[PDB]
C-alpha cells in the first residue's frame, strides 16, 4: 500500500506534521493528522482518465492556522483559517515510468529550497 | 530579485533542466528551459488578492516529451506530449511569515521521495 | 539593481523597520515589512511617461497601527488603522541628472527634523 | 511661531537657497526665494479637517530648472522651466504628538539621500 | 543574468557611450545613458510568444543629434532632435539555440561596417 | 555603384552564403543567392522620403531552411520555413554624414557577438 501514514511537514524530528490514512470514498484518498479535526492538516488524491489520452491527479492540501475560539466563555480548538493548495497533474498515457519519473522531479525542483517560486511564497511575495 | 533561473529538475549535476526568465507581463512571470520553444519546459507564476482576506497564487509547470515529427520528410523538433501541473494556494492575509514557511514545508513534505503521493505519480498509480 | 531593502524607520538600529522587496508585477515595485499582510508597512513606487515631455514618479507608503483583534471568539493579528502618504512627482523630460539630484535633496531637506513641516506633522498641529 | 525663513537647499553655507515669508493671505503660508516669481523656489502649506476622521496638509514646492537659465530673462514657455511638487498628508484625528513625530520621520526616512526614491528622481530614472 | 551594462558606441576606449540597465517595469529591460532623458540614448528590449508558432522580440532604440546639441539644454521640437530605431525580429519555435545563433550572425553581418546598409545610413543616401 | 555582391553569411570562406544584385524594378533593391528562387535567401531595401522630413529605410531578409519536397511523387527543392526580418529606419532630413555614420555603428554593435541581443536570439531565450 501507498496509503500509509506520512509526514507532511518535516520539523526535524519534532514537531513534524504527521497526516494519517482516514477515508478512501469514490476515488478521493484522504488523510488527516491527530487531534481535533478541526485543527487538522489534511490531504486528498485521485486520478482519473481525464480525456482519451490523458490521466490526471488532483492533489489538495489544508494548512490550518491553529487557534482557540472563546465565545460566551465555552471555548473551542479551531483553525483561525486555512491555506489552500490545488494541484492538478495532467500525464498522457503515452508517458512510461522514466517520463513519469522525471515529471517528478520537476515538481520537486520547482519547490526546492532556494529557488525563486518558494522563496517568494516563504516571504509573503511576488516576483520581482 | 526572485525572477531568476533556477534547476527545475535535478540530474546530478548533469542533465539537470534549468529554467530561465522569458517574461512578466500582466503580473505571469514565466520561465522557459533553453532551445526549441517547442521542446522547453515551462513555469509560470502569479499572485493576487482573491478575495477581501485571501491572496492567490497560480503556478503552472509543463514537462515535455521531447520529439522529432516528420512530415513529408521535413523534421521538426516537437513535444510527442506534454504533463501539465497545475496549483493554486491561497493563503490568508493574516498568515505571518512563520506561517508561510510552514505552507512551503507542508508542500515540501507532500512531495518528498517515499511519500504516497510522489510514489504513487513516479509509477503510473493511484493510491491502494 | 536598486530594488533593494532598506530601513523604513530608523528606530536606531533597535526596533527598526525594515521593507523588502516583494513583487515587481504590472510594474509597480512593492516592499512590505516582515509581519502578516494584515499588519504589513507597505511602500510602492512606479514611474511613467506620463506626457510626452514628463516622466511621473508615483510613490505610496502606509503606516499602520497594529493591534490585536479578537474576531469570532478567535484572535488575529490586524491593523487597527493606517496612515496613507502619496507622492507625486512630475519631472521634464530635459533635466539633468544633476537637476534631479536636486529635486531629491529638496525633498530631504522638506523633512529635515526641525524644519517647519515634520515639525507641524509630529505636533499633531498646523504651521503658524 | 513658525512662519520663519528656512534654507531650502543645501549647499553647505557657500550658494545655500534660503526662502522668507511671503504671503499669508488665507491662513496659506508662503514663503518664496530672492528671484523673479518666475525663477523663484517657491513653499506653501496649509492644513484643513479634510473630513470628520482626517486633518490634511496641502504643502506645495515649486523648483526652478537651473542649467542654462537666464537670471532675470523671461524664459518661454513656463512649463519647460519649473518643476512642481505637490503633497497631500492625511492624518487621522486620533493622532498624537508622538504619532506625527514618527510620521515625519517616516518622511524624511523616504527622502534621505542614498535611498531608492532620491536616487532615482535625481538621476531622471525610475525602479529597476 | 543578462542584465547588464553595456558599450553602445565604441569610440575605441575614449567618449565611448555607455548605456546602463535604468527600468524593468513590466519584464521590458530598459538601459539608458548618463544624460537627461530628452539627450539620453535609449534601448529597451522584450519578447513574447507573439501567436502559436513564434516568438517574437522587440528592440527600440532611441539615439540623440548630437552635432549642435546642447549638453543639459532644453532642445524643442523634440522630433528634430532624436532618431528611432524600432526592431521586431519573429522567430518560429522551432528554432534551436544553433538556429538563433545564425539568425544574430545575420544581423550583425547586415550592419556590418563597408556593408551597403551601413554604408547608405551613415551618408544620408538610399540604394544607388 | 553601391548596389553589388555581398556576403551574407559568413561561415569562414566555407559556406559563406554570398547574396548578389538580381533586380531593382520599382525601386526596390534586391539580392537572392544562388539558388533555385525556391530556396535563396533574399535581402531587399527601399529609401523612400516619408514626410517632408524624413527620410525611411525599409530592408528585409529572408533566410531559407532548404528541403527537398516530395510532391505528386516527385521531387522538388523547397524551403522547409523562412525566417523573416524586417526592417524600417527613419533618420531626419537634418543628419549629416557623421551623424548617419553612427547609426550604421550603432546597428553594428547591438548585433555583435557577445552583446545580449545577438546572444538571446541564438539561445531561443529572452532578455532576463
Same mark, same amino acid.
Given at each position: 500500500?501507498?496509503? $500509509?501514514?506520512?509526514?507532511?511537514?518535516?520539523?526535524?524530528?519534532?514537531?513534524?506534521? %504527521?497526516?494519517? @490514512?482516514?477515508?478512501?470514498?469514490?476515488? #478521493?484518498?484522504?488523510?488527516?493528522?491527530?487531534?481535533?479535526?478541526? &485543527?487538522? *492538516?489534511?490531504?486528498?488524491?485521485?486520478?482519473?482518465?481525464?480525456?482519451? &489520452?490523458?490521466?490526471? *491527479?488532483?492533489?489538495?492540501?489544508?494548512?490550518?492556522?491553529? !487557534? $482557540?475560539? %472563546?465565545?460566551?466563555? #465555552?471555548?473551542? @480548538?479551531?483553525? !483561525?483559517?486555512?491555506? *489552500?493548495?490545488?494541484?492538478?497533474? %495532467?500525464? +498522457?498515457?503515452?508517458? $512510461?515510468?522514466?517520463?513519469?519519473?522525471?515529471?517528478?522531479?520537476?515538481? &520537486?525542483?520547482?519547490?526546492?529550497?532556494?529557488? +525563486?517560486? @518558494?522563496?517568494?511564497?516563504? !516571504?509573503?511575495?511576488?516576483?520581482?
Amino acid at each position: 500500500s501507498n496509503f $500509509t501514514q506520512f509526514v507532511l511537514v518535516d520539523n526535524g524530528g519534532t514537531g513534524d506534521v %504527521t497526516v494519517a @490514512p482516514s477515508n478512501f470514498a469514490n476515488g #478521493v484518498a484522504e488523510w488527516i493528522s491527530s487531534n481535533s479535526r478541526s &485543527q487538522a *492538516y489534511k490531504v486528498t488524491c485521485s486520478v482519473r482518465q481525464s480525456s482519451a &489520452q490523458n490521466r490526471k *491527479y488532483t492533489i489538495k492540501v489544508e494548512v490550518p492556522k491553529v !487557534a $482557540t475560539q %472563546t465565545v460566551g466563555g #465555552v471555548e473551542l @480548538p479551531v483553525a !483561525a483559517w486555512r491555506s *489552500y493548495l490545488n494541484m492538478e497533474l %495532467t500525464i +498522457p498515457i503515452f508517458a $512510461t515510468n522514466s517520463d513519469c519519473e522525471l515529471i517528478v522531479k520537476a515538481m &520537486q525542483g520547482l519547490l526546492k529550497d532556494g529557488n +525563486p517560486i @518558494p522563496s517568494a511564497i516563504a !516571504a509573503n511575495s511576488g516576483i520581482y
